[PDB]
Design a protein around this ligand. Structure first.
Ligand SMILES: Nc1ncnc2c1ncn2[C@@H]1O[C@H](COP(=O)(O)OP(=O)(O)O)[C@@H](O)[C@H]1O
Ligand SMILES: Nc1ncnc2c1ncn2[C@@H]1O[C@H](COP(=O)(O)OP(=O)(O)O)[C@@H](O)[C@H]1O
Ligand SMILES: [Mg+2]
Ligand SMILES: [Mg+2]
Ligand SMILES: [Mn+2]
Ligand SMILES: [Mn+2]
Lengths: 374, 381, 374, 368
DNA sequence: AGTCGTTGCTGATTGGCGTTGCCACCTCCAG
DNA sequence: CTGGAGGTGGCAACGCCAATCAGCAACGACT
């Protein structure tokens, strides 16, 4: 799962059609590239276009469909986003587009047209929305709720995994590791117990006792119980990653039913405390390490080699930001390619290649470099 | 002279949505009868007269009925504020009670007064001291710690007691009158008030403890306790009201008077079989009113809808159940013995066995539970 | 409300006893003051002490009590925070402290010791948790739930008001405007409809009709319907404040049951848009203006004379940040004292009054300037 | 023989943010002083002693202090429960009140009492009749109860030459109401006819806060509240009636002016007019701050105009309590208007609107 | 006519509200 | 020092319900 090309047409402040190819003269080194520009220029819009093309959805907007489409640019009758990604050495293409009735800047939002195809032979693999989503999920291994946790870190949602509730962390882990059977076991146990109870026997008593142990609707309880090993492996990988990203802290799981992680402050004689006490920058670094561990966890089943960090580099001071960027450079020296969006002046010099985005004298629109114009 | 020592009435208290109106009325009537029988000169109520700052209407009705029916006996009455009732609520009726052979103190600084006997002659020096709220006796200042503020409070309350007892001695002078003292605070014979800081008064009638006891082995300093059981932790204990006698200006003796129990209560332990066995003792008894029970079911992982079982067991009985609980607290999580084990390697049966091993159940149900668990895997395949 | 002095002891990274007294020589002008220092130095801890001493809570930790206290520094036996504030020309002092058993770090946590007393009179007003909280809420007008939204803007939670549920937004509006009679009406309508329905198990259908119109438990429906006028009154002040902060946008109420604020883009021919589509910096500025308006909604009853916000300026470029700082300086003319947490070098150079939270390497502790030691 | 007639004290009433403790105290001490001066035989309070059913702490202290100070004077006293007063709040202390030459009646059906003079000789028949709850007993039911109760008193008096007095807390035809007057019998009775009162020698009534002679006869009166309980009656002086009896018949009725201690004023007009009307208190130095109701005639936002109103007042020895516009804010509109605005968006069929309006009104009243 | 483009009609999720229970916090006490 | 009983409130899991998206078949406009 590496983004090869990105094509978008009239999304947010980016009027017109543009394409960015990550195999041209820039990005040839696969190094750090920094989307830079003023506020409200379409920097976040590029990552939103990528996410929309992949999964028909945006971090800000819950759904874009026949109704409530508000990602399309004003006084514009059509918008589309297309990406090319490579999985297991072969490349695919994803397409999502929507146009207005009679091609007017007003009128009904027509049902969007989507497709998924191979670049090897051009064969169309899926055109329905549901079938495309299912097929791309099976192919990539990442749903939206895993793409937005491992590959794309939105601004303000970097600590979403750290601050998520146990239910939606265990559900993420079971799907990521392909160990979903335990949820079905709890669902079946709860259904059997409820069916036995509604008839009203010692068998009902045994069913109740079994339900109190592992049984629960939607499979929450036994899933949370079982994913302890997965959380321990993940925190091991995250600690190994974090040793070089921030040397002060370590990570370990706590002795609680809720899937939670505690830090071990090696400076203060290994005093262990909860992550709720971490500073903003420390929590950002911990969440980045956890995301990298999420990527490394499934490297033996499906390999993801791209990472996008929307924001949160400001929470760091200069004396820590340089170390974080050095660790990111060390990671980027491997197969992983990473792109960072920030306004801080220090990162202006360290990252030499930039996808600059510029607004136009208050007209309300914005354009990036003409070399990306179609 | 003779006085009674009582405290912790807690009028208007609601006890698991129940009301203590009848019990309090019966206790007050019994106290009036006892005072008339024993020819008492004064009655002292050491704080916690009301269970809240704004007692309900019937609590005020009970207090008014007691203070108006006490006029027949002619004996004096002293009511002090506790940590529970409100200073303003008690000061509401100060002047109106002043005409009804009754004195109520809620605030600090109230000077010592002379208790008259039934014939009007000076009997004793009261030296009334209510629950000393910190906002009344100290002034806060910046730059202190949590323990330093407590030390200042203790020093201030000790100084207040000493100065007020000195004023009481000055008032007494030469007449042989026993200087009674009063308070509503915790003593241990730290944040408690040491007993050795009390002045050398002839008697100190304290409050804030619901259990009758002697402090530091000094019989002239006593806790009278509540006259009725206010919780299940004291249901089986008998409650006392002290009858104190003085002679020739010195303390003579203290006598304990049992307050008859009006509303019986009991507490039960053990499993459901033990609960049934203990409920057997009420199979055929005419109980007026029905006895209130607290049931603590010892956990053996029965995990049943025990409220329905208790309701069915106690339906035919003359029994009302106020509370039932159990000790089911336990953690449920996997311990990773080594990092080499991952959720893909371990089988479903292995994980379920790891789950069961954390529970202390036996083979009497382990085999059946494992069979039931395997039935689920059977029906998904 | 305004803060006169802050005294804390052994909170987070700030081992020792520190007293920061405003109205001194450096702070006499009521001008801009910024708290500067490396990440993890304890800057947020200064703002955590102010919230702790007042409302027994801190933004990161839901509650601190006997059962848990993660705020006091490791290898230390006690912690305390005490603030002096002034309401309507009269000064008050709030105090919160906790000590470990036997003065040993391994001992169990004892109950906190809280007080609230006038500064000049010296009389104690409250000594218990609930009494102190209720009395300070009545005195200041605003409890914790309104402090954290109109007077202190914590890190990462500036957009809490916009992103909150409509229920929470309406509840906050009632708290500020003291209009709970509508919620009480709706709740009792729902209760009486339920009672009539159970008594059934022609009045029932009429009760159900009234319940469908305005009836709901805890009064959701009628609260939301009634608070629209308050939302419009707030939007007026929000537009007034936002005109100076960011001249592009204006705010307009959504025409839907779930009370929400749409935005008008004056540059795009006054095209109206949902508020979800705003950029990060634009959303931060909108939230700041809306919070300033929210503190100006009750100016006649209980005026608020200070504002604290935490590293929200990291999402602004060098020009939008300059406009926002000019607006904040202009608002400082009114006498509202602003305290800012940041790492941006431009604004750190701009603001001359600073509280430098110096960090001690290796130990993990930190200290202020020598003049603030006690 | 003399009797002071007062009612509608409304003790413990919170007037907006403010409280009426000082006004009530300066009224009660003056009332005791005038009672001693006129050597009155009894003082009667017919209803609304307390503003609500759960009076605050200070209101009860004021009531108890007044009753205690009554003993030094020697006058008998009567208390009646009004529409806002509640049983088990006045009736709970009844037994204690008996020992202090005071009788308290809250429940109906109380037998008539003989009111003694200062020398101990009988002076009159009281006929204690409080605010009659409909559940405790409709227009005829009030009338026959009054006739039956008067007949019982007539039997008790026999041929003795004593006046007969009657009490009541009810609205009557020809009366003028106010905003603070809470209505009673919302769904059963509209007004009591003044001609149905039994031929008692004098009638003492409350409920109405304005002193009024009702029905055209002298022996029926409204005494009204002793202090202004609303902004619509600030300028009208308050009265307490000192009735006199002799040879079993009414002699004369006199009005006593209660000295006002808390100035209250109402402003009107545009902001330009108010900027001039506020100059009535420029550098006057009123030691009790004046309470003002400002009826601004502007369309400007209330939360914006209150700022300049406060700015103008800051240079004056005045304190504004209420500002009302004569766009809208939620603090202005009535609950009925706000609910109707919900009904308007729904179908406007009157057949259901009338029932829904009645249901909403009864719900709101059950809240109050 | 054809072809495409736009519009109107069922089923499967999904978020929202209410119900019941469980657990945690505060306060006044007792071992 | 610690526990512990007794309100009081908050959160969470489950049940039922109404709104919405996706799929499908039937007319209007442009060549
Ligand atoms: N439907 C729309 N039409 C036009 N502009 C829009 C629309 N939705 C959002 N925008 C604007 O597009 C811009 C996107 O900026 P964004 O990429 O979020 O900035 P940043 O990278 O600084 O966070 C903002 O100015 C936003 O208000
Ligand atoms: N209980 C504790 N003992 C010691 N240090 C702590 C404790 N809790 C938090 N800390 C540390 O105190 C520091 C507080 O920094 P903070 O004020 O959050 O920084 P910033 O202003 O950059 O957000 C962090 O290093 C945090 O990990
Ligand atoms: Mg952004
Ligand atoms: Mg921070
Ligand atoms: Mn009335
Ligand atoms: Mn009245």
């Amino acid at each position: 799962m590496k983004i090869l090309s990105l094509r978008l047409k009239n999304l947010n402040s980016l009027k017109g059609e543009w394409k960015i190819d990550f195999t041209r003269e820039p990005f040839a080194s696969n190094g750090l590239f920094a989307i830079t520009g003023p506020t409200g220029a379409g920097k976040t819009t590029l990552l939103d276009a990528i996410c929309l093309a992949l999964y028909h959805e945006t971090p800000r907007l819950s759904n874009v469909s026949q109704s409530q489409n508000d990602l399309m640019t004003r006084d514009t009758a059509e918008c589309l986003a297309e990406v090319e990604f490579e999985v297991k050495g072969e490349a695919y293409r994803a397409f999502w587009s929507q146009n207005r009735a009679r091609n007017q800047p007003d009128g009904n939002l027509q049902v969007p047209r989507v497709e998924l195809a191979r670049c090897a032979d051009g064969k169309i693999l899926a055109d329905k929305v549901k079938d495309k989503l299912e097929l791309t999920a099976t192919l990539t291994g990442l749903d939206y709720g895993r793409f937005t946790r491992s590959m794309l870190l939105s601004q303000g949602q970097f600590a979403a995994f750290l601050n998520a509730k146990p239910k939606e962390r265990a559900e993420l882990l079971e799907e990521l590791t392909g160990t979903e059977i335990y949820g079905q076991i709890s669902a079946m146990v709860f259904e059997q117990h409820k069916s036995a109870r509604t008839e009203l026997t010692q068998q009902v008593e045994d069913w109740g006792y079994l339900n109190s142990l592992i049984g629960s609707k939607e499979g929450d309880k036994f899933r949370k119980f079982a994913q302890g090993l997965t959380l321990d492996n993940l925190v091991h990988l995250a600690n190994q990653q974090l040793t070089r990203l921030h040397g002060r802290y370590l990570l370990q799981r706590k002795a609680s039913e809720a899937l939670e992680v505690e830090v071990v402050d090696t400076w203060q004689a290994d005093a262990v405390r909860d992550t709720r006490t971490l500073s903003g920058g420390e929590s950002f670094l911990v969440s980045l390490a956890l995301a990298l561990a999420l990527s490394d966890l499934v490297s033996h089943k499906t390999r993801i080699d791209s990472l996008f960090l929307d924001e949160g580099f400001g929470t760091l001071d200069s004396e820590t930001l340089d170390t974080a960027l050095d660790a990111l450079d060390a990671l980027n020296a491997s197969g992983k390619t990473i792109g960072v969006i920030s306004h801080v002046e220090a990162m202006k010099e360290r990252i030499p290649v930039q996808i600059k985005v510029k607004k136009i004298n208050g007209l309300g629109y914005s354009k990036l470099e003409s070399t990306f114009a179609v | 002279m003779r006085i009674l020592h009582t405290s912790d009435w807690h009028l208007g208290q609601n006890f698991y949505s129940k009301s203590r109106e009848a019990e309090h009325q019966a206790f007050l009537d019994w106290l009036l009868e006892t005072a008339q029988t024993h020819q008492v000169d004064a009655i002292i109520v050491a704080g916690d007269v009301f269970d809240t700052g704004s007692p309900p209407s019937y609590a005020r009705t009970l207090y008014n009925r007691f203070v108006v029916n006490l006029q027949q006996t002619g004996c004096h009455l002293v009511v002090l504020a506790g940590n529970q009732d409100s200073v303003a609520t008690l000061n509401e009726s100060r002047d109106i009670m002043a005409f009804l052979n009754t004195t109520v103190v809620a605030s600090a600084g109230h000077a010592p007064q002379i208790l008259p006997r039934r014939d009007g002659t000076p009997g004793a020096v009261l030296c009334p001291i209510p629950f000393l709220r910190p906002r009344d006796i100290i002034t806060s200042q910046a730059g202190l710690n949590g323990i330093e503020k407590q030390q200042h409070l203790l020093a201030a309350i000790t100084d207040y007691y000493q100065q007020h007892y000195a004023d009481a001695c000055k008032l007494r002078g030469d007449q042989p009158l026993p200087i009674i003292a009063t308070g509503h605070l915790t003593t241990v014979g730290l944040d408690a008030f040491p007993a050795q800081n009390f002045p050398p008064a002839d008697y100190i009638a304290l409050g804030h403890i619901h259990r009758a006891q002697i402090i530091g082995g000094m019989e002239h300093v006593r806790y009278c306790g509540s006259p009725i059981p206010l919780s299940f932790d004291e249901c089986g204990k008998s409650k006392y009201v002290h009858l104190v006698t003085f002679s020739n200006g010195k303390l003579e003796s203290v006598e304990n008077l049992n307050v008859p129990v009006t509303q019986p209560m009991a507490v039960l332990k053990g499993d459901l079989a033990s609960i049934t066995a203990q409920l057997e003792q009420w199979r055929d008894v005419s109980q007026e009113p029905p006895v209130w029970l607290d049931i603590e079911i010892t956990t053996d992982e029965y995990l049943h809808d025990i409220q329905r079982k208790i309701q069915a067991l106690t339906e035919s009985l003359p029994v009302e159940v106020l509370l039932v609980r159990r000790s089911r607290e336990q953690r449920e999580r996997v311990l990773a013995s080594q990092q080499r084990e991952t959720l893909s390697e371990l089988s479903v049966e292995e994980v379920f066995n790891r789950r069961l091993a954390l529970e202390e159940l036996d083979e009497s149900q382990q085999q059946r539970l494992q069979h039931l668990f395997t039935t689920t895997l059977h029906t998904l395949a």
